Amino acid sequence: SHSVKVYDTCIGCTQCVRACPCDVLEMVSWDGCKAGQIASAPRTEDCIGCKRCETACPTDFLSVRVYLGGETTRSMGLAY
Amino acid sequence: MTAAYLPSILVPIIGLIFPGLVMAFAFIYIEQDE
Amino acid sequence: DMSASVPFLPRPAALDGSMVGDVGFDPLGFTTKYDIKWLRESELKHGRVCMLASLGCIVQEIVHLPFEATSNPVASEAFFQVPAGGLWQIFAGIGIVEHFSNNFKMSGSTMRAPGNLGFDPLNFGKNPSARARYELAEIKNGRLAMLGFGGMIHGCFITGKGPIGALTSMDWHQS
Amino acid sequence: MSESVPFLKKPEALDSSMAGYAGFDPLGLSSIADIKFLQESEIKHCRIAMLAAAGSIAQDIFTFPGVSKVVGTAKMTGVHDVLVKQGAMGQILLWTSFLEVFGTIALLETLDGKRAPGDFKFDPLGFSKNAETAKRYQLSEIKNGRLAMLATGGMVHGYFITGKGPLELLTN
Amino acid sequence: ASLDPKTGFPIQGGSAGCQPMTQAASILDKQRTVLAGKITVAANKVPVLTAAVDKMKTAKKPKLDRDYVLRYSALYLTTLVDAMEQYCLRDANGAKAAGGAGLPKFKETLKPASSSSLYSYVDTVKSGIAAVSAAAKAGDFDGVNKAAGDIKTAADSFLSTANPPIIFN
Amino acid sequence: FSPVPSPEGTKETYWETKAPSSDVLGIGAGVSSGNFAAASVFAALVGGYCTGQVIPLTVEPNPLFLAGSFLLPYSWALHVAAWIQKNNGK
Amino acid sequence: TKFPKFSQALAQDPATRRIWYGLATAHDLESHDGMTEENLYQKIFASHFGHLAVIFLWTSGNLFHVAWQGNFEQWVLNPLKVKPIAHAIWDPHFGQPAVKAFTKGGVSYPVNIATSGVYHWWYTIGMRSNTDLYAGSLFLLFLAGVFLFAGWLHLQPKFRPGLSWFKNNESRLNHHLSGLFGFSSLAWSAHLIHVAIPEARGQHVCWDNFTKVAPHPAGLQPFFTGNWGAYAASPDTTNHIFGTSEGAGTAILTFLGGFHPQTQALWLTDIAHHHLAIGVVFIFAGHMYRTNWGIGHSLKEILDAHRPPGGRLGAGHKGIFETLTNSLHFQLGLALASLGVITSLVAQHMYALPSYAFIAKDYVTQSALYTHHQYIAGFLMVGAFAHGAIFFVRDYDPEQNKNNVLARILDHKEAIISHLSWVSLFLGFHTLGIYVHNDVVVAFGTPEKQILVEPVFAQWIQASSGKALYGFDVLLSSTNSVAANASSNIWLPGWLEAINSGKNSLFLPIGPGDFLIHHAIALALHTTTLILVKGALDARGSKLMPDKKDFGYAFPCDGPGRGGTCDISAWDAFYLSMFWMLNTIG
Amino acid sequence: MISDTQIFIALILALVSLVLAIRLGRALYQ
């Protein structure tokens, strides 16, 4: 699977989760940012590696970071 | 040429049997799981 | 502390006087780099082969088989003169003895006390203490034989006469 | 300050206990090379030169049976040129080199400090038993060796310039 | 029973059993078949030179190639003489030339290649080398041809009187 | 990533001072700066002389002048050592 | 599901990508699962012995196929007229016109004509017959077996070298300089003096007679007296016919210079004296480092002490010792940059100074050898920069390398890359512009208007080495010069003959076309360096991707965000510079 | 010229090299 990380520079804008086509990311409560929430990745096995979450990230360096790793049928986007 | 028979004997073996056999074995090894 | 053979040099650590023929003579430190048992078994094998060779060269001058290609006084010349197939037969036969000996184990596998193949049919060594004296005698005779055989094989190369001829006839009054 | 050379400073690596000490090291070469290495090198030079000085003298006095036939008239260095063509120079070189191979091991022990510089424990006759006679005799060996080093060069250069040889140069 | 014309190896097997363990041949005899085979290769390359010199003479403008004649002499004729000298050495002194006196060295202290019954043929081939070179300097095509023929006759004569044992081994 | 070995007697030679410590001279650490400066000028003159006397090189050059000609580059390292020793108070 | 046994991430891939990636990552032993450093260095050691053996099997194959199927003995008789045979053709797809068309070389079978020059090399070094080419093939098969057994043996538990052995820099350098470089160059002088020199002079010398045949008539007595110049006395005459006794001298070591007048190659006595000189030099250089007896240099001490007191290099080379030793990619990059420069030297010096007899009249061989070694040169140089990029990504630790030469190179990475961009653009705009100016003016019927710039600097260099064509009268070209007078008694007469004669490729005449193409090559070398240097310096990060190090050396992109990140990896700058390498060697 | 026996000796030594190559490849592969 791919490995998806969220760094503590996340402002909790929820945009990376909305971008996610594969329900990899979700919002959890976090007191670090003003929004009271940070992104989380409890479903990186469904991560295809599209990196749409990275594009939606408005932080200077993407708080969400996809690291392409081992490929599976799910992470390869194979309908066969 | 001395041993002129050897090019006729080896070139088909090295050029057809060798790849065929090693491709067959390589195919079996790459596909196998255990 | 200090080697008996070389007083200035220190005694080699992996010697200790336990083996026969131990005067502390390992200046080049082979014992450190290489196993003592392999060195000892090789020393005994070299000396035993040399003792047969030292006897062989002298005997071959004094008496030979009554055939052509075996009538050469000089040892080195005799090697090339004798049937080569016979030489290759000797080499393989010695190889069978070498495989038979050491339980078919060579290098690390063999190490059986070094230099013993269990070849003692006759009870020449009635006492074990006498056998220890014989073991010292064997190694000292083997060492002498190594130097001796090299000395007469080189005598054959220069004199071209064989060992006993080489001692008896030298260029005493010739440049 | 130094004993031998009053103007210069006492050599730092040199001590009174050491044999043949006169505090003589004007160029300070003891700092440059290890003093134990230098000490053994001096003793090796001392002994080879001592044999060489007496050698030249003895060869002028007399030769061994047959050497005169092998070398017609050459002496000192010239006989060496004849003996490389024969086997004497090579055979001595092979045996001296073999002893020097053990000498290399001994030099390594000296650099370690296990062995005294130049001490090969060669006493067939024990003339250094007293241990103060040993100090004196080591001083004598060093002094006669330094003199012989000078002397060997002196008589060999006399051969180079005149061809006479050491005793013959005085007689002629 | 004979030596191959080109490769020079033993040709046919044809208690003196050829098989290694039972071989009765000495290392001297095996060295002699090696030398005889090398003599055979060098002698059988003499027709090639004869053909080349004939091609040179029949050309529209004919010039002797001193470089070809001298390089052929250097490559085969000198080799033929050295192989024959070694066979003569082994025939005369005996086992000593086979390594009985040690490594090949100067002052080998063994009987010379001369005083051998087969040495006269070696002298003929040496004369042939001298004639091949002299003709090449002169530009004489016929001289090279006859000189090579003299070498060919001498080498064949050497092998016939030698009767070398062929050790298939 | 694993301990990198160095020969026994390896010591620290990184310097940020005016001159490196004399330990960078190895066996020449105890030589005085005057002795290097005099050896440097001596080596420059004898090396330059030995170099100069064999500039037209022949098939028979004097081997002592060849060996003595090596003192010219050696003199460069000698005066660098002279500078190091003077700035270490030696 | 188990083919990449070294990679569980690939062995669980259900696609055809697993086969490709397992094949392509097979030799990257550092990335294999559960890889320790001990096992990494021991597998590299054993696989280096396998490369050694492959090289020896390849050379034994060339020797065997020439001994068996070549015309070596026909070629050595007449080397300027006969075309060398590489190997025979047995192809069941051939027609009978094809079989007849390839039956050249003086033989009765189809053949490939060799462009490798191995005939000229084997001729020059002594080989005369098929029996000794075959003997060389046999010996290399034995050596290949010896190094295959050594590779297996050094994988056995008692014979496994430790990491302390693999990183003994001083003992490895001492032995590779004094034994591998120096003693084998000295041994190569022995081969020339004992074998190649006598057999170039007609006298056969083999294992059968080389201990009873003296290379010199006096014979090791002038060497052991200091009468070394007696080994240069009576050199080979200008009338010498190579391979024969006519015109031959007795010298075994000379410095004649120039070329043998017949073979148009360097004198073999010059080559024997070259390897003796370079051998003694390398042997002396192999006593530099301290191993076990207290004399020599510690490499750590040398690197730490070379920091200029002006502070312009920062901490200098403090910590470079550890970085080099710990980083196999830094070593590979130094080795490949060094090797790439040498095979470029090999290509440039072997066409201008050929060493092999009757080559440089084999125009196909000269063209193939130059082209071959320049392409190998471009591959090695690009790979050196590739493994410098891999070094930065994988093995470079900034904390261990604080303010070094390496950190300070990264600190000004933009000054380096932007000035390489400038010089690339500078050269490209002008060289192309002058070329296009020339094309447009010649097209318009006005060749005189062409901007033709003489290569005066290079011509001055040629003249400084003795070319009299340009009339510079500098150094060697001037008869009354200190430089000219110094070499007059030794190598200058031969060199002046060689350089001034127009029959050789030594310092070939250069004009405006040469200038323009050299500037084109400057643009190409600078542009390939720009791409490779940009890849190496930006390997660990950039403004576009700051954390590029975390992704590795070869990754596809970072996606379409931030404008687009295609070809952003350091591997992709290898990829882009490979085209520029091909263009420059083109 | 090269004999058929000489070619067979070369083929024997290359087979020995093949066996040693197999043994090294198996050792490197583990």
Ligand code: CLA
């Ligand atoms: C590199 C070595 C090599 C060799 C030695 C050959 C040999 C041959 N090819 Mg070629 N070929 C090769 C590579 C090779 N091929 C490659 C790489 C390609 C693709 C570009 C081709 C494409 C090709 C075509 C398109 C044709 C040939 C043909 C031929 C035959 C020559 C014509 C003839 O006399 O007909 C006489 C041929 C026969 C009587 C056929 C004999 C059949 C053999 C002996 C049976 C072997 C059993 C088989 C190998 C079992 C292997 C199993 C596997 C595990 C290895 C001959 C058998 C022609 C052909 O097939 O001939 C009919 C033909 O039309 N080849």
Ligand code: CLA
């Ligand atoms: C004298 C002692 C000695 C010698 C000879 C060698 C030799 C070698 N070692 Mg080393 N090694 C030694 C001691 C020695 N070692 C010690 C003491 C250690 C431990 C500290 C090591 C540790 C060590 C390691 C860790 C490794 C080696 C490796 C190697 C091999 C290098 C690969 C190769 O083919 O390069 C050959 C290089 C040359 C022949 C010289 C290059 C010539 C330059 C580049 C240009 C010259 C061009 C010239 C004209 C050539 C023309 C050819 C002709 C066609 C014209 C080589 C066989 C490596 C290897 O492959 O393992 C087997 C390796 O990984 N060694």
Ligand code: CLA
């Ligand atoms: C006049 C404005 C200007 C100035 C002062 C510079 C200054 C510089 N540029 Mg250039 N550059 C400019 C415009 C300018 N740039 C433009 C518009 C582009 C896009 C084509 C570039 C593309 C560019 C590249 C690709 C490179 C530089 C480099 C450099 C540096 C080296 C100097 C050099 O060789 O120039 C080289 C100049 C060019 C290659 C392009 C020239 C572009 C035209 C001629 C200038 C534009 C005129 C502008 C419209 C003026 C309008 C003002 C008017 C309204 C009053 C230097 C910092 C190089 C560098 O970093 O090296 C250190 C380098 O590699 N520049």
Ligand code: CLA
């Ligand atoms: C003919 C083919 C060609 C040409 C000309 C170039 C040109 C260039 N490449 Mg490219 N490249 C090519 C093929 C080519 N490449 C290919 C096939 C690859 C493999 C993918 C690459 C990969 C590559 C990389 C990876 C890099 C380059 C770089 C460069 C530059 C190197 C020369 C330089 O710095 O200044 C020379 C400049 C020129 C030759 C430009 C020509 C000047 C123009 C034509 C002026 C004309 C004005 C005219 C009025 C326009 C009319 C337009 C009309 C519509 C009005 C330059 C822009 C490097 C770079 O940018 O370094 C700074 C770089 O990093 N190239």
Ligand SMILES: CC1=C(C#C/C(C)=C/C=C/C(C)=C/C=C/C=C(C)/C=C/C=C(C)/C=C/C2=C(C)CCCC2(C)C)C(C)(C)C[C@H](O)C1
């Ligand atoms: C070449 C060659 C050969 C040879 C050979 C040999 C044996 C060569 C040996 C050469 C030697 C040993 C030369 C010695 C020179 C000593 C000197 C200059 C010291 C002088 C004293 C000084 C400066 C000051 C002293 C001092 C005095 C005065 C007072 C002040 C204090 C003090 C310091 C005490 C062969 C045999 C191989 C033959 C071959 O064919 C050719």
Ligand SMILES: CC1=CCCC(C)(C)[C@H]1/C=C/C(C)=C/C=C/C(C)=C/C=C/C=C(C)/C=C/C=C(C)/C=C/C1=C(C)CCCC1(C)C
């Ligand atoms: C250490 C020591 C201790 C005490 C003091 C000491 C005595 C002074 C000192 C000794 C010192 C010294 C100097 C000791 C010296 C020892 C030396 C130099 C020994 C020489 C050995 C050579 C041999 C055995 C050759 C054998 C050849 C064979 C089998 C075959 C040859 C042949 C081959 C190739 C093929 C077959 C046929 C032929 C042609 C015959």
Ligand SMILES: CC1=CCCC(C)(C)[C@H]1/C=C/C(C)=C/C=C/C(C)=C/C=C/C=C(C)/C=C/C=C(C)/C=C/C1=C(C)CCCC1(C)C
């Ligand atoms: C890339 C590669 C992979 C893994 C890593 C690696 C190991 C380091 C590397 C190395 C690869 C290497 C080095 C590969 C090396 C490959 C080699 C050397 C292959 C040699 C093959 C020779 C053959 C099949 C000859 C057979 C002869 C015969 C059967 C004759 C027999 C006979 C004849 C007729 C006459 C005599 C009697 C008999 C016995 C009857």
Ligand SMILES: CC1=CCCC(C)(C)[C@H]1/C=C/C(C)=C/C=C/C(C)=C/C=C/C=C(C)/C=C/C=C(C)/C=C/C1=C(C)CCCC1(C)C
């Ligand atoms: C990217 C990368 C990242 C970090 C790691 C890394 C691997 C190290 C690195 C790679 C770096 C790479 C790949 C670096 C590549 C570096 C290269 C190829 C350097 C070339 C150097 C050549 C020189 C200095 C020639 C000097 C000639 C001279 C002085 C001739 C003089 C003369 C003589 C003697 C004779 C003629 C007269 C004159 C002219 C006077």
Ligand code: SF4
């Ligand atoms: S987009 Fe970047 S910032 Fe907005 S939530 Fe997802 S991670 Fe946190």
Ligand code: SF4
């Ligand atoms: S990569 Fe595509 S799938 Fe994986 S997390 Fe970012 S958005 Fe969701």
Ligand code: SF4
């Ligand atoms: S296009 Fe460029 S960015 Fe989009 S995926 Fe392919 S490479 Fe990555």
